[PDB]
């Protein structure tokens, strides 16, 4: 993590994250495919999600989440950059070829973990079911329906903690603060996700956000009464309604969960 010298008006506050562990140039080619840019537009053609557009060409990488190979020792080749994600991914190699990308744990550059219904059991990077692990451990990549794949604790530097165990349900405390009960045969992976040098970065200039795929936002007090309920005014007005979405939704604190189907699996709400 380096600082930049103020040579220009853009370079004054750029904070980079450089890494020399990353493999310089190539992706492995059969694990790579085409991805198109949406613009934030559904099949009616209209903008649903605002402030998206532009950017750069990207290839989607088929990152493996199931880890269904069992009893095979896998050996890491190298750690690569992945553009549609905040973590680093690793290239694996099993005992008989069959290379494959996974989310990289804290271990890097040819360790050899073992992916099984239980084996070699404890490292960073061993996948094994959630009943055969000690309490108080830190895991990541947690399935919720068995066979479906990792859904929770998957972004950069993220993890969860085991707390309790009884019956079919193995309770864990999420990164947010919510404590879920999770069914016990869903697999998970010991350790933490690789790139934690990511909350320490600053873009510096206005055109740095724009070549990543985020389009300018405009405030609601600088519009007309026809466009946004904060509306127009004379001079700078305090927008004399209570603060509200452009569709009429209260925004400074209003509980909006209404699922009413998964409420049994939650122990404690996030506070």
């Amino acid at each position: 993590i380096v600082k930049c010298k103020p040579t220009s008006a853009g370079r004054r506050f750029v904070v980079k994250v450089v890494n020399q562990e990353l493999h310089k140039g190539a992706p492995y080619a059969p694990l790579l495919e085409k991805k198109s840019k949406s613009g934030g537009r559904n099949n009616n053609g209209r903008i649903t999600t605002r402030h998206i557009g532009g950017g750069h060409k990207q290839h989607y990488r088929l990152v493996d989440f199931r880890r269904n190979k069992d009893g095979i020792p896998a050996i890491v080749e190298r750690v690569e950059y992945d553009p549609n994600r905040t973590a680093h991914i690793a290239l694996l190699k099993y005992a008989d070829g069959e290379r494959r990308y996974i989310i990289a744990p804290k271990g890097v550059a040819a360790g050899d973990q073992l992916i099984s219904g239980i084996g070699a059991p404890i490292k960073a990077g061993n996948s094994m079911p959630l009943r055969n692990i000690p309490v108080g451990s830190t895991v990541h990549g947690i399935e919720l329906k068995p066979g479906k794949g990792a859904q929770i604790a998957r972004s950069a530097g993220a993890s969860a903690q085991l707390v309790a165990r009884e019956g079919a349900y193995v309770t864990l405390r999420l990164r947010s603060g919510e404590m879920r009960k999770v069914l016990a045969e869903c697999r998970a992976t010991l350790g933490e996700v690789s790139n934690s040098e990511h909350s320490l970065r600053s873009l510096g200039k206005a055109g740095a956000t724009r070549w990543r795929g985020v389009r300018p936002t405009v405030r609601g007090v600088a519009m007309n009464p026809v466009d946004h309920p904060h509306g127009g005014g004379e001079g700078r007005t305090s927008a004399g309604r209570h603060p509200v979405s452009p569709w009429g939704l209260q925004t400074k604190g209003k509980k909006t969960r209404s699922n009413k189907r998964t409420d049994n699996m939650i122990v404690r709400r996030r506070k």
Partner: protein, 147 residues
């Protein structure tokens, strides 16, 4: 409403007619063959098979007497992990336990089970709720040893 044909439920009889909820007869009894709606059309045929109904009531309990001598033997030795450590590390099983109670027990296996007490804690003999009835069940004894 319907005419009963089974005797091993909690209200069943030989040929008594009962009045039950519409969802309990539509969904459960009739698509298996344990009851029949009361009619006035084939009633000359139901009276002819009353001798065949009581011979069927002297055979369903006869096969059960030659069956209970193989269920409570408790000779099933499940090969789970966690030999001599103390911490839960064994393969408990929710789909592989139905094949274990069918290779040396009753051959029926279908587990649509509502359970928050599925997996078991540290190494020892505990109980797994298995498919035993259709509107109740109790838990079956499981032996967990080393591998």
């Amino acid at each position: 409403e319907v005419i009963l044909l089974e005797k091993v439920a909690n209200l069943g009889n030989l040929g008594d007619k009962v009045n039950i909820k519409g969802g309990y007869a539509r969904n459960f009894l009739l698509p298996q063959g344990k009851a029949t709606v009361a009619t006035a059309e084939n009633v000359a045929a139901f009276e002819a098979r009353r001798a065949e109904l009581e011979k069927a009531a002297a055979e369903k309990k006869a096969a059960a007497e030659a069956r209970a001598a193989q269920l409570s033997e408790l000779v099933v030795t499940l090969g789970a992990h966690a030999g001599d450590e103390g911490k839960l590390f064994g393969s408990i099983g929710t789909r592989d336990i139905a094949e274990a109670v069918s290779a040396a027990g009753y051959p029926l296996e279908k587990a649509e089970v509502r359970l928050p007490n599925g997996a078991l804690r540290n190494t020892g003999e505990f109980d797994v709720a298995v498919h035993l009835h259709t509107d109740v069940e109790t838990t079956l004894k499981l032996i967990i040893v080393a591998e």
